[PDB]
Amino acid sequence: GPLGSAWGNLSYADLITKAIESSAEKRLTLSQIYEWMVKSVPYFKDKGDSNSSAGWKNSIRHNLSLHSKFIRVQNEGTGKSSWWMLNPEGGKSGKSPRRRAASMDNNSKFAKSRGRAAK
């Protein structure tokens, strides 16, 4: 029959869900879900334009607002970016791997000051 590659057609809800599942914490903020789609789906990568973002981001927010499987967690303090995750009882648990991150460097060596060059 037809189709022999890819996932066929994953809905917005499925992609949002996969982003959350892909996270080690099983929860993601809206910005993280956006980044996951840009890196995971070439369609959303191509549509990553600033103006296109209007419909891009609104559709995710609409799907999240259905709340059938999506739940929302407050954050530890800087709660402007709430967490979005899957209902845990409304699913099964799993574990996503982790990897190394961060680095450290420095671009300074001396201070700059001058004065008292007189008697």
Side-chain angles (χ1 to χ4, degrees), residues 47-64:
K47 271 78 195 75
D49 152 64
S50 304
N51 284 71
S52 299
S53 290
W56 205 112
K57 298 171 183 168
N58 190 36
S59 302
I60 293 165
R61 188 168 177 272
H62 177 87
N63 271 249
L64 285 170

mmCIF file of all heavy atoms in Angstrom, residues 47-64:
data_model
loop_
_atom_site.group_PDB
_atom_site.id
_atom_site.type_symbol
_atom_site.label_atom_id
_atom_site.label_comp_id
_atom_site.label_asym_id
_atom_site.label_seq_id
_atom_site.Cartn_x
_atom_site.Cartn_y
_atom_site.Cartn_z
ATOM 1 N N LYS A 47 9.642 26.837 8.275
ATOM 2 C CA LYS A 47 8.665 27.848 8.683
ATOM 3 C C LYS A 47 9.107 28.619 9.929
ATOM 4 O O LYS A 47 8.294 29.257 10.584
ATOM 5 C CB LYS A 47 7.289 27.185 8.893
ATOM 6 C CG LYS A 47 6.442 27.136 7.617
ATOM 7 C CD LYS A 47 6.848 26.028 6.641
ATOM 8 C CE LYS A 47 6.245 26.245 5.257
ATOM 9 N NZ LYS A 47 6.967 27.350 4.524
ATOM 10 N N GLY A 48 10.393 28.571 10.250
ATOM 11 C CA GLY A 48 10.908 29.245 11.439
ATOM 12 C C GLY A 48 11.024 30.759 11.326
ATOM 13 O O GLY A 48 11.564 31.410 12.216
ATOM 14 N N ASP A 49 10.527 31.314 10.231
ATOM 15 C CA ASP A 49 10.550 32.757 9.986
ATOM 16 C C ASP A 49 9.775 33.548 11.060
ATOM 17 O O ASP A 49 8.770 33.080 11.616
ATOM 18 C CB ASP A 49 9.965 33.025 8.594
ATOM 19 C CG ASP A 49 9.327 34.390 8.482
ATOM 20 O OD1 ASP A 49 10.023 35.413 8.609
ATOM 21 O OD2 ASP A 49 8.100 34.435 8.287
ATOM 22 N N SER A 50 10.254 34.751 11.351
ATOM 23 C CA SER A 50 9.671 35.616 12.370
ATOM 24 C C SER A 50 8.202 35.956 12.129
ATOM 25 O O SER A 50 7.418 35.994 13.073
ATOM 26 C CB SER A 50 10.465 36.920 12.428
ATOM 27 O OG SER A 50 11.839 36.652 12.655
ATOM 28 N N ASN A 51 7.811 36.214 10.890
ATOM 29 C CA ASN A 51 6.411 36.544 10.611
ATOM 30 C C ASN A 51 5.534 35.294 10.665
ATOM 31 O O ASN A 51 4.418 35.320 11.191
ATOM 32 C CB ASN A 51 6.279 37.234 9.255
ATOM 33 C CG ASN A 51 6.739 38.666 9.300
ATOM 34 O OD1 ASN A 51 7.915 38.952 9.421
ATOM 35 N ND2 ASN A 51 5.805 39.573 9.214
ATOM 36 N N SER A 52 6.051 34.196 10.133
ATOM 37 C CA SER A 52 5.348 32.910 10.117
ATOM 38 C C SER A 52 5.100 32.411 11.532
ATOM 39 O O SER A 52 4.160 31.647 11.786
ATOM 40 C CB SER A 52 6.176 31.875 9.356
ATOM 41 O OG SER A 52 6.378 32.287 8.014
ATOM 42 N N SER A 53 5.933 32.871 12.457
ATOM 43 C CA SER A 53 5.837 32.500 13.865
ATOM 44 C C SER A 53 4.456 32.768 14.449
ATOM 45 O O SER A 53 4.048 32.091 15.397
ATOM 46 C CB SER A 53 6.862 33.261 14.693
ATOM 47 O OG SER A 53 8.184 32.831 14.417
ATOM 48 N N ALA A 54 3.741 33.746 13.905
ATOM 49 C CA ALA A 54 2.412 34.085 14.398
ATOM 50 C C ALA A 54 1.476 32.855 14.402
ATOM 51 O O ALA A 54 0.838 32.563 15.410
ATOM 52 C CB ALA A 54 1.821 35.223 13.538
ATOM 53 N N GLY A 55 1.406 32.131 13.290
ATOM 54 C CA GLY A 55 0.544 30.953 13.221
ATOM 55 C C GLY A 55 1.204 29.725 13.822
ATOM 56 O O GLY A 55 0.552 28.854 14.405
ATOM 57 N N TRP A 56 2.518 29.681 13.682
ATOM 58 C CA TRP A 56 3.361 28.585 14.158
ATOM 59 C C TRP A 56 3.153 28.355 15.663
ATOM 60 O O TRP A 56 2.843 27.252 16.117
ATOM 61 C CB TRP A 56 4.790 29.070 13.894
ATOM 62 C CG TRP A 56 5.896 28.122 13.713
ATOM 63 C CD1 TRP A 56 6.572 27.894 12.568
ATOM 64 C CD2 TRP A 56 6.574 27.350 14.715
ATOM 65 N NE1 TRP A 56 7.624 27.053 12.757
ATOM 66 C CE2 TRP A 56 7.674 26.709 14.073
ATOM 67 C CE3 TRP A 56 6.382 27.147 16.094
ATOM 68 C CZ2 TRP A 56 8.575 25.895 14.766
ATOM 69 C CZ3 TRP A 56 7.275 26.311 16.785
ATOM 70 C CH2 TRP A 56 8.367 25.698 16.111
ATOM 71 N N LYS A 57 3.322 29.423 16.429
ATOM 72 C CA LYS A 57 3.215 29.386 17.888
ATOM 73 C C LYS A 57 1.769 29.326 18.370
ATOM 74 O O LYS A 57 1.477 28.681 19.380
ATOM 75 C CB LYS A 57 3.947 30.606 18.455
ATOM 76 C CG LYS A 57 5.450 30.575 18.102
ATOM 77 C CD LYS A 57 6.179 31.861 18.446
ATOM 78 C CE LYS A 57 7.640 31.752 17.980
ATOM 79 N NZ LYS A 57 8.377 33.068 18.012
ATOM 80 N N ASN A 58 0.861 29.981 17.657
ATOM 81 C CA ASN A 58 -0.547 29.990 18.062
ATOM 82 C C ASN A 58 -1.169 28.599 17.978
ATOM 83 O O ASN A 58 -1.958 28.219 18.832
ATOM 84 C CB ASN A 58 -1.355 30.961 17.198
ATOM 85 C CG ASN A 58 -2.753 31.179 17.729
ATOM 86 O OD1 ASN A 58 -2.971 31.206 18.934
ATOM 87 N ND2 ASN A 58 -3.697 31.346 16.843
ATOM 88 N N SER A 59 -0.810 27.831 16.960
ATOM 89 C CA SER A 59 -1.367 26.486 16.803
ATOM 90 C C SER A 59 -0.957 25.563 17.953
ATOM 91 O O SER A 59 -1.749 24.740 18.416
ATOM 92 C CB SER A 59 -0.915 25.892 15.475
ATOM 93 O OG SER A 59 -1.308 26.729 14.402
ATOM 94 N N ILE A 60 0.273 25.710 18.430
ATOM 95 C CA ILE A 60 0.751 24.912 19.565
ATOM 96 C C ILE A 60 -0.041 25.306 20.799
ATOM 97 O O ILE A 60 -0.500 24.456 21.555
ATOM 98 C CB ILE A 60 2.273 25.134 19.818
ATOM 99 C CG1 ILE A 60 3.059 24.548 18.635
ATOM 100 C CG2 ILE A 60 2.719 24.529 21.174
ATOM 101 C CD1 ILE A 60 4.490 24.999 18.553
ATOM 102 N N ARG A 61 -0.212 26.603 20.999
ATOM 103 C CA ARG A 61 -0.936 27.103 22.162
ATOM 104 C C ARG A 61 -2.386 26.635 22.140
ATOM 105 O O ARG A 61 -2.930 26.274 23.174
ATOM 106 C CB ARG A 61 -0.850 28.627 22.199
ATOM 107 C CG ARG A 61 -1.413 29.242 23.462
ATOM 108 C CD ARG A 61 -1.032 30.707 23.533
ATOM 109 N NE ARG A 61 -1.611 31.370 24.715
ATOM 110 C CZ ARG A 61 -2.814 31.936 24.769
ATOM 111 N NH1 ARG A 61 -3.626 31.970 23.739
ATOM 112 N NH2 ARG A 61 -3.207 32.483 25.886
ATOM 113 N N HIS A 62 -3.000 26.623 20.967
ATOM 114 C CA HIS A 62 -4.369 26.133 20.827
ATOM 115 C C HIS A 62 -4.450 24.663 21.231
ATOM 116 O O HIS A 62 -5.317 24.279 22.000
ATOM 117 C CB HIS A 62 -4.841 26.296 19.378
ATOM 118 C CG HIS A 62 -6.218 25.760 19.133
ATOM 119 N ND1 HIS A 62 -7.375 26.475 19.319
ATOM 120 C CD2 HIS A 62 -6.627 24.531 18.711
ATOM 121 C CE1 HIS A 62 -8.403 25.684 19.017
ATOM 122 N NE2 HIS A 62 -8.002 24.489 18.636
ATOM 123 N N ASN A 63 -3.534 23.846 20.723
ATOM 124 C CA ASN A 63 -3.537 22.409 21.026
ATOM 125 C C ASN A 63 -3.314 22.157 22.520
ATOM 126 O O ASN A 63 -3.909 21.256 23.099
ATOM 127 C CB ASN A 63 -2.451 21.690 20.218
ATOM 128 C CG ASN A 63 -2.936 21.228 18.865
ATOM 129 O OD1 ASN A 63 -3.077 20.043 18.624
ATOM 130 N ND2 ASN A 63 -3.184 22.152 17.977
ATOM 131 N N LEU A 64 -2.463 22.958 23.144
ATOM 132 C CA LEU A 64 -2.203 22.829 24.580
ATOM 133 C C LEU A 64 -3.440 23.190 25.393
ATOM 134 O O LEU A 64 -3.708 22.582 26.422
ATOM 135 C CB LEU A 64 -1.061 23.757 25.002
ATOM 136 C CG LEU A 64 0.361 23.325 24.616
ATOM 137 C CD1 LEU A 64 1.318 24.468 24.901
ATOM 138 C CD2 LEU A 64 0.793 22.084 25.388
#
